Ligand binder design. Structure first.
Ligand SMILES: NC(=O)c1ccc[n+]([C@@H]2O[C@H](COP(=O)([O-])OP(=O)(O)OC[C@H]3O[C@@H](n4cnc5c(N)ncnc54)[C@H](OP(=O)(O)O)[C@@H]3O)[C@@H](O)[C@H]2O)c1
Ligand SMILES: NC(=O)c1ccc[n+]([C@@H]2O[C@H](COP(=O)([O-])OP(=O)(O)OC[C@H]3O[C@@H](n4cnc5c(N)ncnc54)[C@H](OP(=O)(O)O)[C@@H]3O)[C@@H](O)[C@H]2O)c1
Lengths: 488, 488, 488, 488
């Protein structure tokens, strides 16, 4: 028997919904990964219909004429109910609609909250009081941002947890659904070539990089109140840090993984102001179009803002595995490229017998783009030479695994929610540790409003970030030359 | 000032000379790697001339019309002197010819003994007594085979050492001049990713493979008296073992490397007859041409020979790094392919949390063909899967370094002799250890003449070799699927 | 300000109370380790008084005439209330007595349940419903045994947890209060000489020994229904195993320690019947008095009982640290001595250069008697000898720290409860893992009633236990000679 | 058959001979450790007899009336021959005397050179040319000092090696014959508890201490020309360093051990002047007798000497095991005590969970006095405390092994020479490395004559030595309290 499933989309008319969630569920249904008895219900304030949502979401489905019948079958199982985020009557209407659905009484209900943070409390309380299935499971999905600091996030987390259990709350960090971020676990705990060296005795520093080649691009008002830290460093880079630095779990069960992650998080001291390099991007007079403007050139950005669009932060995990190893979280918008990457710079080889011509090994795990794992290693120079040179042992997805289509992170995450897997989701205690690590720094920056180091649009950011990386132990040489091969 | 150099080729009319040595020295001169004042003198019994040697060696030089001037200059500095390997008068004639050479009195003399083993004693004693330069250095080059067993090789080694010092003797193992064999040292002692795991706590077994897709191909008389063991296992695979298993030298000086190599050799017990699988190839009735005949089908092979053309031998290095780790030396002619390869099968990862679907890591260093270093590692299955799958972190020379032309092993070895580097040459004590490891097994096989396990031409050899590998700890699964990529 | 404290002793007239608890609290008060405002209330069915309890407990206080005034001051703060374990009115009487106490409304209440397991449910429910302090904390103490198997213990643990939180429940394992058992943590995680070797790469096997030189000595009816396994192996040896095998906690906080302990417990498979050696002691006809009788010679033991008084069990912790290392739990009553001991037999040293006359290192942590940590190590034979001999690096408490009086385990445990430290107490999940490890074996033994291997009273137990230890990897040589020194 | 042996003592009338060598050979004969056919021949310039040598050496034999018959039997096989150290005729006389001995033609001859360094050349050349046995082996013994610097020692070492082989030369470093110095090898390579931690990843610094509670005590002329460095640091502390830092040999054969020792020596850079603290002791006015005078108060010491009687030197072994670990060689005369000691201060435990009250582990190997191995370790404070405290796991010879009489170093060394064991003797290349390590520093001090830091007689030496130790990484706390136990 196949259990009936319901996919309730809160704020179905929203930007995030029509841009990512509806295409995600359509792709999941298209490949037959959803349960056979799966229905999708849209819920928002706007008085739209199934046809209106269909027309709004078609340009993002990327459908083909060979999938027309699947398209109508998918949309024949779609529904929309208009209502309010605080009026209960709309929620009893939604419950009645779900019960009128085929075998909806025992159907598994799944709620996605694609709504602004201001309405999460009301939506969760109303769902818990009115829209809970009595037979099948009920799992709710909440979306970034998770509060603004330790106390603001803690209050919302406690209100949500007071209503739902930890096995019902699914906090989205869509980078946890990335292919390479999930491959991190297999890399670490399935291979003997990465086990004995994953410690402070061999790793000199850890660099977690997040780059965007574009700035806030017009809508700077939303980014002004958060900044680069709360936007990227607190969640994406920090969860990447947790996965890189975690101990081996007792099993691949979700609870063991999240226990290891929170154990690593609990061993990080609060961020010191002397380990932070903040930058705010200024326009490039040689820039092309959008590159000509800076952050202050956005009309929606209030005048005289000190919000940082670049950050370089050094963290330390005071445990027996990571004692003294700097964890450099370097993120920034309007940089020279787009890149999410894990870089492990290893220590110098002891007893160097190659006359200082060797350089530190670097295991690099590039999450995006061009998913690839390569380790920067010293090989003998090809040809009639004896000196070592920097090379790599490279595994590049998209060349080794061309026929395999790496799915979107949202697809995999929603499939995990359907399957009940909670390994790649944020637990409450992880959120508390993440916010308490960065809260003193955020409060100090807010109260002191320090001036960031301006960096030209499209550049690599402030040079003081490079100075900080050099000071804390990271070695940059610039002599590594890499060429994309051909005619294999 | 550039010192004058002389390249004396003993047995200049020989097969090895005209096939490899003269092209090697021509290539070295062509790229300007030899000293500017370098002359080459040919010496053999046949009454040939410089023109005759030129005509005989041209089809192997692979010269081009753009190099006619360089070829003429190279051959203008070539000379030939006919003589005998036991008559002194010919050797005083050669000495007078070398003195009549431009600044030959202080010229550095280098002797290559491209001669059968039966004349090494006479040639070396005559060279020491008559053909020694009094000002420049004198380095002699002796060639495989080095004796037949412990005592036969020991007598020749002691006789040669009684005439020349260890810094004057250059024992050729042309696999030590291979690109990847020399890259072994950089891989091991220049990278922190291969240091903590290069021990018995992580490596389950070591496999050293030598394969040829052809048999003795007509000239089986020479191979009958030696067999596959003395031909390949005693020198090539064993030196590969020494380089893989050695401790880190104090420096890249030759003496430290050879001390580490002999220290590793001294820790290997004698080969037990129960760890050896011997095979002799029989023709394939479905074979194509030369594949239709077996070893016994060669007319020059004496009737009823039990010589083995395949061998699988398990060795143990009883030291603190390699205690209990089997070193499987598996070599064989008339196999399914040509391949020289170092394979390190690592242990199972402790505390397997992936439900036994992970497999042992394998670091593979393929010496030939298609020089490449790759480590077989477990990555998360690309796509909508969570199970780990076997993959590789691959560095392939000829794709990453296509423009770089990897030189011949003889070129690099002769350049090392010219430069005085003795790291990649066989020391006397290394030869003694190599012969004492295998001598009891060879004597037992000779005195007992056991019947080898026949294997069809072009196959993988006897299946009892795979039984031995499975018994000693090596795990073969056959589920590793690899595809060569394209359009990078 | 010093908060008022109340020490409520349930079953104050009981054997355990008057033998251990009242002397323990008297010793704690005598040294001034209790809070200044501390009162002790006795509660049981018998209609006794403070004077009667005083007279009954004096022979176990070991008081001296120099402590008379402290004795009356201690007993002036003692009180007794008679009642029932199921009648509520007695519990309101106890609550009224506690409120009539000096500042008892806000006093911290501590309950010790020195009662048989049959009444824990009623006592705990009545305490929760009637005897809870509304201002100060309330911590309850429950005593061994914790159920009989997985389900019987689970029902009681769930019932108690339904009434009290994990920070209010204090499960007693008095071996966790032992000096050396607590020193285990400092030994493991405060010293760099015991960190890199505390893993499967160096430890061959782990032996946890519990010996008693006496049998059930008359009261065999209580031991018949439990046996040696439930009595000792399930709690004492298993908690010793957890402390030996645990990972390093994030901090010395109780929750981190108990998380590591339960993580280790979760990695142990269920006990296989082929790894168990069971013995039941038979009398020694050469025995002296009590030693002349066997277990079947006890009149209170039912005829034809197969209960085991000796056990040797091999356990395996399938994690990355302890994969494949046998954990031998060997316990038995009526053995040749009394001894609780942790023994870590290390692996043979790789690359043995001493011609096989070295032996495995053994780090021994003797909990009782004569508390001592010594590591069995190979030193050069003193005198004119070159061979290594077994010796030890010994630290013996009572010789190095003779002036320091090592306190009783109950004293330290009750002081920890007073201070709110819960590191050395059994958590609910630890109990679940402990019972699920041994439940199938206990059920199989009960349903199959196998005949144990008889062993003479005062002997070392069945020899099949030593066969099992030899089979699983433990090496016993018997050549270790030790002499107690003198005149330092 | 027992081969005849001859013990030739050059300079038999000398101080070293009559104080140490004759008692040593008497003790060796008394216990029956010498070969049965062993004779001793004395050789010096003075015209003495066997009776005169007997009377001169009796006060140092420590004989007893129960050993009279053994004493006459020992002296009945003693002989004396007077001669010259350069006249050959005396050496032919000695040879004729040795041949007139019972079966002296094939007797094994052993020469001890208890002579000043000025006559070693003549004595060795004369012994090689005249006093070499043609049947039995001939082993010569040379004594400290071995030259004054690199070139002065190298000339003598090359001259001796030109006459005798390395298996015939026995260079005495009597600290290599000490009990604990020889126990170092068993400690390191027979125990798994000292193997994984004997590296730079766990050891913070190495301290080698040599202390004497007395100064030059009158005969300062001999010490003036050498100083504390050449006297102690170059040989005793440096050989202790070699044994501590060596790699595991392939076997217990002498050649493998000496190869490892020279390999370690070759990895030390020359001593920098900024890592040296030099002191010269000044008298203590509150002094006792000899303690009232300083080094300058010795009449035989030339006025205005800058010779150092204390030294603290930091060395570095740049290899893969000891990269960056300081090796502190701290020696000094007229200090507060006598002590030769190996101290290994380990690194701080990573991820300290004990709030910084733990301290670095120290493995201490006290060579003299009161031979003992103990490791300073952190144990839980005995009693009602939870904080860790410094303790030790102690093995003290003389308490564990009272009945065993630890022999003199000279006894064991001479027994090794008789048995042909050369493990505990200085090879030529070891001497070259030892002298090249310290030669630039010695030459700089000699040419610059810097003023040492005066320290009062009987003190701990200059405080700048403690500043240097603190600067290079060594941590001194002074909170370690140790008490000698009693009534075991
Ligand atoms: N790229 C992304 O957009 C992105 C990425 C990651 C996370 N998220 C998170 O996903 C959630 C979805 O937001 P969004 O990106 O879709 O922004 P949005 O388009 O502004 O919000 C989507 C829906 O929220 C409702 N809404 C808007 N303003 C509201 C208000 N003041 N009070 C109550 N409801 C309101 C609207 O419902 P009606 O149409 O019914 O009025 C709207 O359709 C956000 O919390 C966002 O932080 C978004
Ligand atoms: N692929 C290879 O050929 C190869 C590979 C590795 C090592 N080697 C070694 O290199 C050496 C060169 O031998 P090769 O391969 O050139 O074989 P080869 O052609 O038979 O021998 C070369 C020369 O040796 C001389 N020679 C032959 N038989 C002789 C005899 N009975 N007495 C004295 N001299 C004799 C001849 O000199 P004249 O012409 O002046 O009579 C001949 O020109 C051999 O020892 C071989 O083991 C060869």
């Amino acid at each position: 028997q196949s259990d009936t499933h319901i996919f309730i989309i809160m704020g179905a008319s929203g930007d995030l919904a029509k841009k990512k969630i509806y295409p995600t569920i359509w792709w999941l249904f298209r490949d037959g990964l959803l349960p056979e008895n799966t229905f999708i219900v849209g819920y928002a304030r706007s008085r739209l219909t199934v046809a209106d949502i269909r027309k709004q979401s078609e340009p993002f489905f990327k459908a083909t004429p060979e999938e027309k019948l699947k398209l109508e079958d998918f949309f024949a199982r779609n529904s929309y109910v208009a209502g309010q985020y605080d009026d209960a009557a709309s929620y009893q209407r939604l419950n009645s609609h779900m019960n009128a659905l085929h075998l909806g009484s025992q159907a598994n209900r799944l709620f996605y909250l694609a709504l602004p943070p201001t309405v999460y409390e009301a939506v969760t309380k109303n769902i818990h009081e009115s829209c809970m299935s009595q037979i099948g499971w009920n799992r709710i999905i909440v979306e970034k941002p998770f509060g603004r600091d330790l106390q603001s996030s803690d209050r919302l987390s406690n209100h949500i947890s007071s209503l739902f259990r930890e096995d019902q709350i699914y906090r989205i960090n869509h980078y946890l659904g990335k292919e390479m971020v999930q491959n991190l676990m297999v890399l670490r705990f399935a291979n003997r070539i990465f086990g004995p060296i994953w410690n402070r005795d061999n790793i000199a520093c850890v660099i977690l990089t997040f780059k965007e080649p574009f700035g806030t691009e017009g809508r700077g008002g939303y980014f002004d109140e958060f900044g680069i830290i709360r936007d990227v460093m607190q969640n994406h880079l920090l969860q990447m840090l947790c996965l890189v630095a975690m101990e081996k779990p007792a099993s691949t069960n979700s609870d063991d993984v999240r226990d290891e992650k929170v154990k690593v998080l609990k061993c990080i001291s609060e961020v010191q102001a002397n380990n932070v390099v903040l930058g705010q991007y200024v326009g490039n007079p040689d820039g092309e179009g959008e590159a000509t403007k800076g952050y202050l050139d956005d009309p929606t950005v209030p005048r005289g803002s000190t919000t940082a669009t670049f950050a370089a932060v050094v963290l330390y995990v005071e445990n027996e595995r990571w004692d003294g190893v700097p964890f450099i979280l370097r993120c920034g918008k309007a940089l020279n490229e787009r890149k999410a990457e894990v870089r492990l710079q290893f220590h110098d080889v002891a007893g160097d017998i190659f006359h200082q011509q060797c350089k530190r090994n670097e295991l690099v795990i590039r999450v995006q783009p061009n998913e690839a794992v390569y380790t920067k290693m010293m090989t003998k120079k090809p040809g009639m030479f004896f000196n070592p040179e920097e090379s790599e042992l490279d595994l590049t997805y998209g060349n080794r695994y061309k026929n395999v289509k790496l799915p979107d992170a949202y697809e995999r995450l929603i499939l995990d929610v359907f399957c009940g897997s909670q390994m790649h989701f944020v637990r409450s205690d992880e959120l508390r540790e993440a916010w308490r690590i960065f809260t003193p720094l955020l409060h100090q920056i807010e109260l002191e409003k320090p001036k960031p180091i301006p960096y030209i649009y499209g550049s690599r950011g402030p040079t003081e970030a490079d100075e900080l990386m050099k000071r804390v132990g990271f070695q940059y040489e610039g002599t590594y030359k890499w060429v994309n091969p051909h005619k294999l």
